[PDB]
Amino acid sequence: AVASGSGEPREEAGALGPAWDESQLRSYSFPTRPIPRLSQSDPRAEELIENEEPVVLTDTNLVYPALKWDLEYLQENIGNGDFSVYSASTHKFLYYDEKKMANFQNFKPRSNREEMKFHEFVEKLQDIQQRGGEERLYLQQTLNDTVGRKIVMDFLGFNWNWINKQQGKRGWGQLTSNLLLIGMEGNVTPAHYDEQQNFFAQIKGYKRCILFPPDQFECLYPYPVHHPCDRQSQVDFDNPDYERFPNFQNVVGYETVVGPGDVLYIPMYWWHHIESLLNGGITITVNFWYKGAPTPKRIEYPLKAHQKVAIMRNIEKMLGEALGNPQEVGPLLNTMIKGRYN
Amino acid sequence: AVASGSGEPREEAGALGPAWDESQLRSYSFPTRPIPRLSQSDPRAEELIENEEPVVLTDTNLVYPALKWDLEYLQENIGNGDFSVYSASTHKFLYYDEKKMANFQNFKPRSNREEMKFHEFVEKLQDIQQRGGEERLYLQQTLNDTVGRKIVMDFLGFNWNWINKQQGKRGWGQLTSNLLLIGMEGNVTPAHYDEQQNFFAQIKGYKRCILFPPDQFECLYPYPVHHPCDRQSQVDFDNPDYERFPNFQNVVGYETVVGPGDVLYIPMYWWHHIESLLNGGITITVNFWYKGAPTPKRIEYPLKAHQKVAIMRNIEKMLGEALGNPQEVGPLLNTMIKGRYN
Numbered sequence A, B: 001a002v003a004s005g006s007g008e009p010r011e012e013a014g015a016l017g018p019a020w021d022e023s024q025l026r027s028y029s030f031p032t033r034p035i036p037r038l039s040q041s042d043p044r045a046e047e048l049i050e051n052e053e054p055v056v057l058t059d060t061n062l063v064y065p066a067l068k069w070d071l072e073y074l075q076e077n078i079g080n081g082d083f084s085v086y087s088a089s090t091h092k093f094l095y096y097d098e099k100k101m102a103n104f105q106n107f108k109p110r111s112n113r114e115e116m117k118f119h120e121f122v123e124k125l126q127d128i129q130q131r132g133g134e135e136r137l138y139l140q141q142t143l144n145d146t147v148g149r150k151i152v153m154d155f156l157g158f159n160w161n162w163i164n165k166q167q168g169k170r171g172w173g174q175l176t177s178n179l180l181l182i183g184m185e186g187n188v189t190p191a192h193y194d195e196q197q198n199f200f201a202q203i204k205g206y207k208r209c210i211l212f213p214p215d216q217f218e219c220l221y222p223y224p225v226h227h228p229c230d231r232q233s234q235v236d237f238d239n240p241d242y243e244r245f246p247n248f249q250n251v252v253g254y255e256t257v258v259g260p261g262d263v264l265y266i267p268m269y270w271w272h273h274i275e276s277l278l279n280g281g282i283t284i285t286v287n288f289w290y291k292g293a294p295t296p297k298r299i300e301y302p303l304k305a306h307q308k309v310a311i312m313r314n315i316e317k318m319l320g321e322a323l324g325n326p327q328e329v330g331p332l333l334n335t336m337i338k339g340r341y342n
């Protein structure tokens, strides 16, 4: 009952029909409660953000000027700088960090990155659609200098007044980046966490977002810190291995479906699983990543979950450095705990 | 064949008989090779010490003046400062660190410490012997200022020329202390390691010493660093729990029996198990503990075993401090490795 997931699908204005329907959602093995959908003026929303809990804001106008963006408009105005585009023979686009590939030679990426011009991206899509292909593409490109003047106009129209005040109220560091995400229906980014505070602005299409608090670290089994898939869950949500990952049986999520105009606050360290609804067409999103606030005066107990995750990360990093080889980290940790702490 | 243990018992000079016999040795579940017994002039002994491997030196005259020490002589000359004396209803005298008891309230020492004057110690022994008691005593007291003039005379007679040169050649730090150990036949100090370099000078009676290199950390299962029995093996050598401690089945020792005049180099981090031969009478030993050498320029790979032990110790210490509670160390380490590194 309380695990109502994304809830009853919203009705679009002027009787244009249900935004989406249950059958566009993938099927998973865990329960989920709904993320609150609130007005930016609702003091409850300010409460959730201040407390680093997720909330969907329905009326920020954060990216009002971008709501007009489609492929046509963007190809026309975005410039001809390079755009990273990932390809995969599967619906899953597992993130990997290429700077860490050097030290796991045995890692072979499922998806491949290719730089290209926007028009080329648009062509590949049309090409795949008209030939019924099963290939999938996901453009994921940070918003840089080579963008056209109209796109820059839109950018300036963003609700900087609102977000700059959020940045200020939360003591967050600088805006590190804005990622532009354009994906095909059915695309999935497997569960992971980021060490950035994130306002995730939905623009075109609908995305189902499933989040897990940092205190579910134990149920989600991140890769080793030195692995390319650092911060990504090892668990295949489509075929969970309960032998390797027993506690995934205890995992409980928070979920919501976002559409044009919604902004989802994804607090730093919160796991998130993001998928573009089945048969919902392409999706477009722009995120806003901010460095988190500085670590307070000195430590205050009890520690929050995210501080414990930070401590584990640091242990793993320092051990890799001390041993002189990230590959020796596991054996040493085992030696340390077997028959001693387990 | 190569696992010949302490070897053929030595013959004492002038046909006074075998120093000791097999039946005075306790029975254990692992194999052992003999520690080399060499002359201080043997360049092989200098080799072993430089390489931090154990060696028994037969002719250092390190504590020549103390070879006359018996209870009578000591009670007469040692002063009347306080002497720590441990009592136990068992042959095992497990070392515990009282400064760490505060944070494991559930730990109850097997042996109890009582301060007393030397003559009182001598009395308790006589008392126990004449009444056939099963109680056991082990005096373990650092050699301080309150010692009489004759004992100080002996002390000055020690072979400082030889040992000071060892300290020098090995770059070791200062002499931290000299412990005086007086134990009843059959007494056992369960296996442990020390973060000091040790010349262990045998004076009266015979002790069987079993050492394990630092690279057997995995087979010996030390208590947690914050526990009172930090550095002690959890394994009961008399009834080994192969379920909890599977790798103790792989443990291999180096052993030797030392007598009046022998000095055993016990390199820093080497595990040692020390027992006073059954039915061999009281034993007397004086050790010489030196801070180890400083850590070289910077790290050189590959790391030695003892450097890995140091790294594990530091991880455990820093985690205790970060979490603000040593009790949370185990749960966090488990969370870190389960389904990730194991």
Ligand SMILES: O=C(O)c1ccnc(C(=O)O)c1
Pocket (backbone or CB within 6 Å): A179, A181, A188, A189, A194, A198, A200, A207, A274, A275, A285, A287
């Ligand atoms: O919308 C995406 O597919 C996505 C996936 C994972 N992470 C982010 C992010 O903005 O943190 C966005």
Ligand SMILES: O=C(O)c1ccnc(C(=O)O)c1
Pocket (backbone or CB within 6 Å): B179, B181, B188, B189, B194, B198, B200, B207, B274, B275, B285, B287
């Ligand atoms: O002779 C002892 O019982 C003993 C036991 C454990 N450690 C030492 C030492 O000198 O390191 C001495």
Ligand SMILES: [Fe+2]
Pocket (backbone or CB within 6 Å): A192, A193, A194, A272
């Ligand atoms: Fe993310």
Ligand SMILES: [Fe+2]
Pocket (backbone or CB within 6 Å): B192, B193, B194, B272
């Ligand atoms: Fe010791």
